[PDB]
Write a protein that binds this DNA or RNA. Structure first.
Ligand SMILES: [Mg+2]
Ligand SMILES: [Mg+2]
Ligand SMILES: [Mg+2]
Ligand SMILES: [Mg+2]
Ligand SMILES: [Mg+2]
Ligand SMILES: [Mg+2]
Ligand SMILES: [Mg+2]
Ligand SMILES: [Mg+2]
Ligand SMILES: [Mg+2]
Ligand SMILES: [Mg+2]
Ligand SMILES: [Mg+2]
Ligand SMILES: [Mg+2]
Ligand SMILES: [Mg+2]
Ligand SMILES: [Mg+2]
Ligand SMILES: [Mg+2]
Ligand SMILES: [Mg+2]
Ligand SMILES: [Mg+2]
Ligand SMILES: [Mg+2]
Ligand SMILES: [Mg+2]
Ligand SMILES: [Mg+2]
Ligand SMILES: [Mg+2]
Ligand SMILES: [Mg+2]
Ligand SMILES: [Mg+2]
Ligand SMILES: [Mg+2]
Ligand SMILES: [Mg+2]
Ligand SMILES: [Zn+2]
Lengths: 102, 144, 25, 129, 110
RNA sequence: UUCGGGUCUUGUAAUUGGAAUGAGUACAAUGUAAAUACCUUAACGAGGAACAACUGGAGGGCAAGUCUGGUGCCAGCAGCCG
RNA sequence: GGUGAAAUUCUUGGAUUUAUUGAAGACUAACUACUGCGAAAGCAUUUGCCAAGGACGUUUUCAUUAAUCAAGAACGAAAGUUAGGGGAUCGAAGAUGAUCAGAUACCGUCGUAGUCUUAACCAUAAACUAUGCCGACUAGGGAUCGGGUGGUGUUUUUCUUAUGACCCACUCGGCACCUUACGAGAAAUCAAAGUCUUUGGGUUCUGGGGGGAGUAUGGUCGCAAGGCUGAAACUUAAAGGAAUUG
RNA sequence: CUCUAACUAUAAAAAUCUCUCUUCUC
């Protein structure tokens, strides 16, 4: 039976979208059923911020960030802990998991 | 509103649609194709005589463990050969080899009944006399 | 069994039967 | 496309009655709708309707009072012989004490009892009760 | 082994049973080949190869393999087929071998 | 007052009586072209009223047994479930 | 290199990485969304040309010219087939190196056909919203795309204004969405799967238990692959749908 | 009745299983 009224795709009026590959297993999966995660982070972690600051010329370097949108498959997304199985009454909710920190 | 047409001048397509759909049934298809006359062991026949060829028993299905005592009979009307079942405790011995036996339907519309595989016909009479009269010793086999 | 592989096995039977008929046509 | 206009009118009446309203706005407003609602007025199943001239098919505003429970067209206007009137009443009306199979005879659009009184019968339009 | 055993009848006849002989149609035979559908092929000690049904009280109650002495009941109406009725566990089979109810040319020993 | 008459009736018992009657035979007559047969009717014709009603079924569907003996997944039954 | 871990493989003829560059072919990242166009497949770099199209605006024009459709036709993903062109990547077959009891499977390295194209075929997909099309009505809440109306609205700046971009309100059309049952369902659920025993708006196609079987045969299309049409004999008491507790 | 910030990141191998299922009424 229908487990998802949206079918998981989130297409609703296209018929076909262009697939994208998984970052882990390289699964040719449609771009909308290709759960996306925008990893924006520091090129140097908080573990080495002090070390870099003490041992860097150009006092108060901006310490540029790194940006990458990861296109996971769905099997990896279940397994690589990105997305989790949910209650059938919890599948309703599409909001992100409540603002990890405020 | 519905798949069928509804106009006052749509009798033709309604009739032909019903006529084309009637073939989906099994009774109507059998009656019109005349499969009973051509392929069935008897053509529209409730009873049929035959000659006993050999005297075999067949094991039952899984939930039922036994060997039902049947008999292979070659029909006289056309020459077909069918297995048939002698229905009672001590009736196998009553029918002897190479005697005329009158087979009847098995009651399940020409299909195997119960736990007995590959049989579709009872045995009602043997050598002119009925099985039920022999089983209660009301009549005896003429032994001709 | 899958309908796919039953279909393919039927197609291979048709392979052999078509080659046989073409030999004897 | 709009094939049977009276069907649209009666469907609108049914929908606006089931929801508990007291008025309907029927758009196309032909002769047959006017006669049908006039018969319903004569028998009380409807209130005080209204024709709104548009110079284009007009419209109708229907007032209800909750007395009606179901309209409905017999979309193929079957030729109903005077012998088959009783069969239609049995198949459509819920009881013999009331209900009316509105049918169009050569003497106009009339309820089945009136047609049986005139001893005339024609095609069937719909049913009200 | 398994949890099946506790569901069983627990019919423990381990002690030496008294072997059953052949009676007016019941005859000894040897399993030649194992077939499917719970049916076996038995070479009887008469020069014939009968087809013997794995039979009630014997189907999933005792497990029998190739080259097993066996007792089988015939059917007078059909001689070709028969029914396996009892199985001898290789000890009383030796006793019958010495007493020689069966031709001794059929030597089956571990 | 235990009762209990059974005061008022309804069944069960190889107890026990008196009746009625055909199914059969059969003088006749009717019937029929002639005969059967039917309607009528002499004379016989019921006590175990032997003048003897079977056909299927008794787990459910489906009314009626978890009584007795026999066979032990045999024999067999069972339209289906069993 | 690569991996769970290894090995096959390339390397002091100096590989792997290091800087400029050059060649080829494919692709069009990030922008990319419960967003758009299209009859469906499908469509994502810029610019020009070619014609086409939906929606809106219209006190413009014809007046039933329309809806659905047997026969007939046009397109029809990927794969595949003939030839000509290319030939980067990735990779059916194959070659091996591993893992295993076996592994000619999954992990790995090479690797033809193919992938990319110009003509000619093919006409099948879980070609799915598993919901035919046209038409009417029925219930509340926001947003979103295209168009159009009004604002004594706001920033814009070209002194003011005209645009544009927003803000508020309304309307038409579209992909959609939230809540709810007062309706429908065997329910999962559906704002249509409602207005269906209170049964009839028009209309096309399909199904009558499972298997045999989308098989055989007979046509027909195709070079071939295969497509369309398409049973029975026989066998079976179930197969199946949704949901509840383990 | 007033607000848009923090972050990572594992995938060795594991095949198979035979009986036998049994009433719910005050
Ligand atoms: Mg599932
Ligand atoms: Mg998703
Ligand atoms: Mg669209
Ligand atoms: Mg057997
Ligand atoms: Mg125990
Ligand atoms: Mg009786
Ligand atoms: Mg009986
Ligand atoms: Mg009995
Ligand atoms: Mg009863
Ligand atoms: Mg170098
Ligand atoms: Mg781009
Ligand atoms: Mg867009
Ligand atoms: Mg067509
Ligand atoms: Mg191609
Ligand atoms: Mg080529
Ligand atoms: Mg390989
Ligand atoms: Mg290998
Ligand atoms: Mg590989
Ligand atoms: Mg490669
Ligand atoms: Mg198809
Ligand atoms: Mg389909
Ligand atoms: Mg069928
Ligand atoms: Mg099928
Ligand atoms: Mg053909
Ligand atoms: Mg299920
Ligand atoms: Zn993956």
């Amino acid at each position: 039976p229908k487990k998802r009224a949206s079918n998981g795709r989130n297409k609703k009026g296209r018929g076909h979208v262009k697939p994208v590959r998984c970052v882990n297993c390289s699964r040719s999966v449609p771009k909308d059923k290709a759960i996306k995660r925008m990893a924006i982070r520091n090129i140097v972690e908080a573990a080495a911020i002090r070390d870099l600051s003490e041992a860097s010329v150009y006092a108060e370097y901006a310490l540029p960030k790194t940006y990458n949108k990861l296109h996971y498959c769905i099997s990896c997304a279940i397994h690589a802990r990105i997305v989790r199985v949910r209650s059938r009454t919890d599948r309703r909710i599409r909001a992100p998991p409540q603002r990890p920190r405020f | 509103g519905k798949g069928k047409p509804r106009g006052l001048n749509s009798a033709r397509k309604l009739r032909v649609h019903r006529r084309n759909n009637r073939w989906a049934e099994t009774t109507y298809k059998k009656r019109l194709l005349g499969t009973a006359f051509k392929s069935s062991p008897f053509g529209g026949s409730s009873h049929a005589k035959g000659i006993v060829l050999e005297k075999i028993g067949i094991e039952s299905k899984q939930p039922n463990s036994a060997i039902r005592k049947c008999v292979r009979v070659q029909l006289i009307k056309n020459g077909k050969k069918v297995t048939a079942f002698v229905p009672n405790d001590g009736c196998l011995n009553f029918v002897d080899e190479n005697d005329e036996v009158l087979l009847a339907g098995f009651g399940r519309k020409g299909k195997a009944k119960g736990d007995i595989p590959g049989v579709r016909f009872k045995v009602v009479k043997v050598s002119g006399v009925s099985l039920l009269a022999l089983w209660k010793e009301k009549k005896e086999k003429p032994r001709s | 069994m899958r309908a796919k592989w039953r279909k393919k096995r039927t197609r291979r039977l048709k392979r052999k039967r078509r080659k046989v008929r073409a030999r004897s046509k | 496309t709009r094939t049977s206009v009276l069907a649209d009118a009666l469907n609108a009446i049914n929908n606006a009655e089931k929801t508990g309203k007291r008025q309907v706005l029927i758009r196309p407003s032909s002769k047959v709708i006017i006669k049908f609602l006039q018969v319903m007025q004569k028998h009380g199943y409807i209130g005080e309707f209204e024709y709104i001239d548009d110079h284009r098919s007009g419209k109708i505003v229907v007032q209800l009072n909750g007395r009606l429970n179901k309209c409905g067209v017999i979309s193929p206007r079957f030729n109903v012989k005077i012998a088959d009137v009783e069969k239609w009443t049995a198949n459509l009306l819920p009881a013999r004490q009331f209900g009316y199979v509105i049918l169009t005879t050569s003497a106009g659009i009339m309820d089945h009892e009136e047609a049986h009184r005139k001893h005339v019968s024609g095609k069937i339009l719909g049913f009200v009760y | 082994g398994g949890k099946k055993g506790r569901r069983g009848k627990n019919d423990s006849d381990g002690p030496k049973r008294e072997l059953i002989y052949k009676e007016e149609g019941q005859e000894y035979a040897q399993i030649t080949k194992m077939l499917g559908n719970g049916r076996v092929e038995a070479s009887c000690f008469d020069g014939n190869k009968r087809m013997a049904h794995i039979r009630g009280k014997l189907r999933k109650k005792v497990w029998m393999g190739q080259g097993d002495i066996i007792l089988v009941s015939l059917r007078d109406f059909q001689d070709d087929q028969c029914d396996v009725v009892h199985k001898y566990n290789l000890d009383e089979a030796r006793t019958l071998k010495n007493q020689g109810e069966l031709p001794e040319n059929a030597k089956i020993n571990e």
